[PDB]
User: What shape does this take?
Amino acid sequence: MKIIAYGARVDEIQYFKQWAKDTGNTLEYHTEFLDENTVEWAKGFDGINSLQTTPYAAGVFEKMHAYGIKFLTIRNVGTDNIDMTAMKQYGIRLSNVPAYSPAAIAEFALTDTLYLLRNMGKVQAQLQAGDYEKAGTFIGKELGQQTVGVMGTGHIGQVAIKLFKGFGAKVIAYDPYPMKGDHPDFDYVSLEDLFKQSDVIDLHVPGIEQNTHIINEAAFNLMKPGAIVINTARPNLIDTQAMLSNLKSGKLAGVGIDTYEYETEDLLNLAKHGSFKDPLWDELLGMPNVVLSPHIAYYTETAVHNMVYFSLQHLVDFLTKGETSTEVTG
Amino acid sequence: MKIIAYGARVDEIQYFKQWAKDTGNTLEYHTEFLDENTVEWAKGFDGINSLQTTPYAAGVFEKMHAYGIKFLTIRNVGTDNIDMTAMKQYGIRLSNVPAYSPAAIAEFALTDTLYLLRNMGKVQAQLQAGDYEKAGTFIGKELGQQTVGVMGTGHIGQVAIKLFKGFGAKVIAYDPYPMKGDHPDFDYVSLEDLFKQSDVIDLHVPGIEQNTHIINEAAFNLMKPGAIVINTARPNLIDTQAMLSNLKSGKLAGVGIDTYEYETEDLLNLAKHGSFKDPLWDELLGMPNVVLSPHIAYYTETAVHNMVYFSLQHLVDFLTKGETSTEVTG
Ligand SMILES: NC(=O)c1ccc[n+]([C@@H]2O[C@H](COP(=O)([O-])OP(=O)(O)OC[C@H]3O[C@@H](n4cnc5c(N)ncnc54)[C@H](O)[C@@H]3O)[C@@H](O)[C@H]2O)c1
Ligand SMILES: NC(=O)c1ccc[n+]([C@@H]2O[C@H](COP(=O)([O-])OP(=O)(O)OC[C@H]3O[C@@H](n4cnc5c(N)ncnc54)[C@H](O)[C@@H]3O)[C@@H](O)[C@H]2O)c1
Ligand SMILES: CC(C)CC(=O)C(=O)O
Ligand SMILES: CC(C)CC(=O)C(=O)O
Assistant: This one.
């Protein structure tokens, strides 16, 4: 078949090329995202494959319907930037890749946890400043001696629980929709108990509106002194302001943030002004007990390979069997 | 009983005090190390407890013998700075703490491994330089998808193997004196195969003279491109020069060094000149794919607590049962 791909990223290229060789299909990829203008390149292809945070507007589906392209598969999870109504209107079907690599994210959460437990940021700051003696004065903690609280026992949450348990840590979890049946690796506890007992709090919950600021001032007040919070999930989960105050007061020993609350706004400022123009960001970046990352928890060779291969397979599924396990409808 | 402790470090104090309360024994501690002058403070105590890299000279044992103190227990592992002959001459007995916390070191090795697999140093360097976009261009790797080669299957090596296996990694190991019997978590392979197949090489071998530069030019030549080497063991294991060349040529993706080859020499320069005066150190410190630490792999609250409690228990063992599991005699 003939498939056209949009939003092709530097690391995806080799996989796109390899998938073409492996399956014998024709794959044409483009750096540009899919919009009303670029969708015109798809005339004559059997399906479209894309990855972008920019909108998938009604116009895109209109031209697709016009060229007879009935399927669109995305390489990521989120569908919030997709005009679903316009899509259903033009009879276009969609599938995403909900679990390209839960391990990539779980491993990143472990990476930030160990980094903070061993005060790696404080250590590196002192070495760079030329103070070798002071660099060795921040006593660390063993993950195997901690109680880790995981919020969200979905795909990623389960993998993170397994990794934490591998260190010998005591693992407790909270999820409004608990798994049914046995799970020897952890115990479900109430949200209050999770906050009160956890040395490390790891977030793996969806970024739906009702989870906005689920970690807020009240949550921070329940936490034990010296707690660590890791967020590789979504930007709206933590009240960054309250977080900062608790870092300053010493309540929180450190935090690992891969999805910064104002990332979207800041990326816009960066484009228009060449800087984040964000004083909160600057303050956090200057604290050695804070480890910020530019939304890269998913960023591994395995994950990127899977984003490409899985999404393309879903496309081939639609095109041959007329159904696929990850079809999205709402 | 009455016990005097030397070389008391900032983090050890609370444990010294707590041990006194817990056992009801009298414990007097000092910041100063044990030498011919300070040993005089021990007159009237039942035993001596110390931790230092400075020498334990013949004179120290002479005054001990004079005050009737028959036992010395150290809080660390190494006994190379102890005049054993002088000690045996004056009938003084010794015990060390060979495994205060193998987990502290194994966890640190995992910390450096994940840090490098996710290019954390490159990421942090770019964020600090204000380049958020570039900070997200260093694709990482999943530990669970790697083949990890562990050198040395002793106390620490075994714990590290367990932790790596917890991630799902394939683990192979090399030890001149293989464990007897079953060990489902890893396979023993020849040294050449370990170098040729490992994505990550983790060292947990003793720093005896014959292991000097066990990781040398020839070893580096056998390694696969993009390999990572972790050394939380001893300063003499890696030919740092050859290592640097292989980092520069791109053969090695990164290294985590907790025991720098010229640490001892450099600490002396630091004292006399206020700087390491080490260009090799400076060059390594400037590479974001190199993670140096000031000999802190053991540095956790659990390890320090155990160094204190275990060594004191060994002292109490000598003083009451006249024997202890960790007595050293050569
Ligand atoms: N940073 C990145 O690079 C990256 C990449 C992919 C996905 N993510 C995000 O990570 C998060 C977890 O993803 P997943 O695949 O495990 O999701 P999942 O849907 O499989 O699991 C989420 C779980 O959280 C539970 N939940 C909902 N609200 C909760 C709350 N208030 N408290 C506790 N649990 C709650 C749900 O019941 C569900 O079981 C999602 O936000 C996902 O969108 C981040
Ligand atoms: N960085 C730190 O803070 C720190 C702290 C404590 C100990 N250490 C060191 O870490 C190392 C490992 O300690 P341990 O308690 O596991 O030791 P151990 O004696 O229990 O095990 C070492 C093992 O390595 C094996 N061995 C010897 N030479 C080897 C070689 N050439 N190749 C492969 N294996 C070899 C031995 O047969 C032995 O089984 C030691 O050097 C110890 O002194 C470092
Ligand atoms: C943008 C993706 C690459 C990562 C992510 O968080 C997602 O799946 O939406
Ligand atoms: C100096 C100790 C605290 C650490 C160490 O490497 C040792 O046990 O000798």
In short: The CA atoms of residues 144 and 169 of chain A lie 4 Å apart. Residues 301-321 of chain A form the longest helix (21 residues).
